[PDB]
Every structure is written in structure tokens, then in C-alpha cells.
Amino acid sequence: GLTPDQAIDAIRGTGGAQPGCRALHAKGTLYRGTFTATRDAVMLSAAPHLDGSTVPALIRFSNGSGNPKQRDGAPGVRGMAVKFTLPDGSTTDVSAQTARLLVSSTPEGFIDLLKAMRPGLTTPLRLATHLLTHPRLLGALPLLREANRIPASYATTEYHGLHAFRWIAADGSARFVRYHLVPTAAEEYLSASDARGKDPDFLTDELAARLQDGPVRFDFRVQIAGPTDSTVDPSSAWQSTQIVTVGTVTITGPDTEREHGGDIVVFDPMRVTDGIEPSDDPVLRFRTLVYSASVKLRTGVDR
Numbered sequence: 001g002l003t004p005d006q007a008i009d010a011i012r013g014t015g016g017a018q019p020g021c022r023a024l025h026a027k028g029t030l031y032r033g034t035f036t037a038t039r040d041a042v043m044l045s046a047a048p049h050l051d052g053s054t055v056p057a058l059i060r061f062s063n064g065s066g067n068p069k070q071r072d073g074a075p076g077v078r079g080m081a082v083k084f085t086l087p088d089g090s091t092t093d094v095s096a097q098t099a100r101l102l103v104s105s106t107p108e109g110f111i112d113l114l115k116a117m118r119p120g121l122t123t124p125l126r127l128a129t130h131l132l133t134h135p136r137l138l139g140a141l142p143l144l145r146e147a148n149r150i151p152a153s154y155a156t157t158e159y160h161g162l163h164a165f166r167w168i169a170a171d172g173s174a175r176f177v178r179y180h181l182v183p184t185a186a187e188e189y190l191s192a193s194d195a196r197g198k199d200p201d202f203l204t205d206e207l208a209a210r211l212q213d214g215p216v217r218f219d220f221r222v223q224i225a226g227p228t229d230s231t232v233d234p235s236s237a238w239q240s241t242q243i244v245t246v247g248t249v250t251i252t253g254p255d256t257e258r259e260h261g262g263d264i265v266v267f268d269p270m271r272v273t274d275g276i277e278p279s280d281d282p283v284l285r286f287r288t289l290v291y292s293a294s295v296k297l298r299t300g301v302d303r
């Protein structure tokens with residue numbers, strides 16, 4: 001179907017894939033913190049970072065746009081990606097953003113919507129046409145709106161991993177889960193009016209001041225799949241309400257140790273670890289390949 005390079009082309013054609021920048025989620029900042037799982041998390045997965053010990057956590061908050069100069073006050077998706085360092089030095093990532101469900105069940109559908117939302121030219125028509133070709137999306141309009149809200153702070157909105165992951169415990173038991181990173185701070189958003197007058201990078205200024213005041217916390221919750229919940233379609237709503245907090249990410253300040261010299265920081269949803277396996281999700285599988293392409297472009301090195 002769609003190839004990694006074609007995805008990058010589509011992204012570039014919409015304003016992303018800027019020189020030296022992540023093709024998408026170009027604008028973002030790194031923060032330092034730690035993660036500690038609840039005592040029962042070990043019953044769900046044998047992953048080392050979920051055994052109750054405290055591990056290092058690198059967090060990047062970003063704007064989904066491919067434009068590194070994207071204004072924070074403009075409508076748009078926000079991202080929160082976390083990289084956990086394990087005892088043996090290896091790392092595992094959790095990638096999440098503001099939409100509750102993926103707009104499409106396939107990489108092809110996603111890219112088509114990305115292009116339909118390209119220049120402001122005839123966007124209304126292009127989007128309308130896309131919707132007629134993608135009925136399911138047309139029936140969840142409120143979710144598309146929710147995904148592009150303007151948060152008062154990166155710390156005052158929630159993020160979702162969307163894809164299902166298979167969590168396997170030491171006893172060999174397994175369950176499929178979807179990731180949700182929820183703030184302990186009250187959720188808060190800005191009106192179009194208030195957002196309009198904000199500085200272009202008001203979210204990073206806000207977060208810097210917020211952290212100076214004290215740590216920021218996000219609870220890591222997993223939604224456990226129900227009997228008819230699809231483990232392969234991230235655009236499909238789940239009926240399960242079996243959602244449990246498995247840990248907390250405590251962020252204490254901006255990072256200054258990473259992305260210097262030749263250090264490359266990439267949050268890949270496929271970077272799992274023992275006790276966690278990716279589902280047969282086509283978008284999930286496609287992402288690692290597209291990210292490798294995006295990284296190669298911004299760094300020059302490939303993997």
C-alpha cells in the first residue's frame with residue numbers, strides 16, 4: 001500500500017519535513033523526571049519499568065504540526081512522549097497525543113486526511129469530501145474537535161497512545177491495553193479568543209514557570225480490552241471501562257543533557273521491552289518505519 005517515503009512526501013507537501021526537524025511534531029521541548037509503577041502493575045506486565053522501582057523518564061511535549069514555528073495558540077494536536085530507561089540501560093517508549101481515537105484504521109487513511117487538511121485553500125471542500133469517503137470519521141466529529149483544543153498548559157490536558165499493546169506478566173498471563181496519560185492537575189483549555197492573544201510559545205513559558213513552582217504529574221492508566229474490543233483498529237471505540245492506574249510520571253524540570261553532540265532522541269511506539277508486545281495494528285507497525293525516515297532526514301544517519 002503506502003510506503004514510508006510516500007508518507008514523508010505527503011507530510012512535506014503539507015508543510016512538514018522541515019530541515020533538521022522531526023517531519024511532524026517539529027516543535028517540542030524535552031523534560032526530565034521519573035516513573036514509578038503501582039504495586040499491582042507487575043501483575044499485568046513483566047516489563048522492568050513496571051515492577052515498582054523508580055526509573056528515569058525523559059518526556060517531550062510537542063505540537064503535532066510539521067511547522068517548528070507553529071503558534072501554541074492555534075488549534076492543533078499536542079503530543080506527550082515518554083522514554084523510560086531500564087536497569088540494563090535499554091529504553092522503552094510510550095507515545096501519546098491529544099486525540100481519543102485515531103482518525104483512521106490504516107496508514108493510507110491517515111495520510112489522506114493529512115493531505116485533505118493541507119493548505120487553507122479549499123480545506124472545507126477537501127475535508128468534506130474526505131468525510132464522505134470515511135463515514136466512521138464523520139460520525140465522531142466531536143472527537144476531531146476535542147483533539148485540536150488549545151490547552152492552558154501541556155500539564156492540563158490528557159494524552160492517549162491509541163494502539164493496543166499486549167502486556168505479558170511473569171506468570172505468562174496476558175491482556176491487551178490502550179495507553180492513557182492523565183494529568184493530576186485539573187484539565188483546562190483556552191477559548192479561541194484567549195488563545196489568539198497568547199505568545200507563540202506560551203505553553204513552554206507556562207510549563208517552565210509551572211515546574212519552577214513544583215513537579216508536574218501524569219498518571220499512566222491502561223484501558224484493558226473487553227470481549228469485542230479490536231486490538232488492531234486504533235480508530236475503533238472500545239466498550240471496556242476497565243481502566244486502571246499503573247503508575248505516575250513525575251516531571252521536575254527541562255532537560256539539558258540530551259540532543260547535543262550526536263545524540264538522537266526518537267520516541268518510537270514499537271520500542272517495547274520484555275513483557276510488552278505490539279498488536280497487529282497496521283498504523284503502529286508503519287510508524288517505526290516512517291520515524292526512521294524522518295530521523296534520517298533530520299540527522300543524516302539511518303537505521
Ligand code: HEM
Binds near residue numbers: 102107
Ligand atoms: C501513520 C501515521 C503517522 C505518521 C506518518 C506519523 C509520523 C510522525 C513523524 C514523522 C514524527 C516525527 C518523528 C521523528 O523524527 O522523531 C512523529 C512524531 C510523533 N508522533 Fe507520529 N505519526 C503517525 C501517527 C501517530 C499516532 C497515531 C500517534 C499517537 C500516539 C503519534 C504520536 C506521535 C508523537 C507523540 C510524536 C512526538 C515525538 C517526539 O516528540 O519526539 N503519531 N510522528
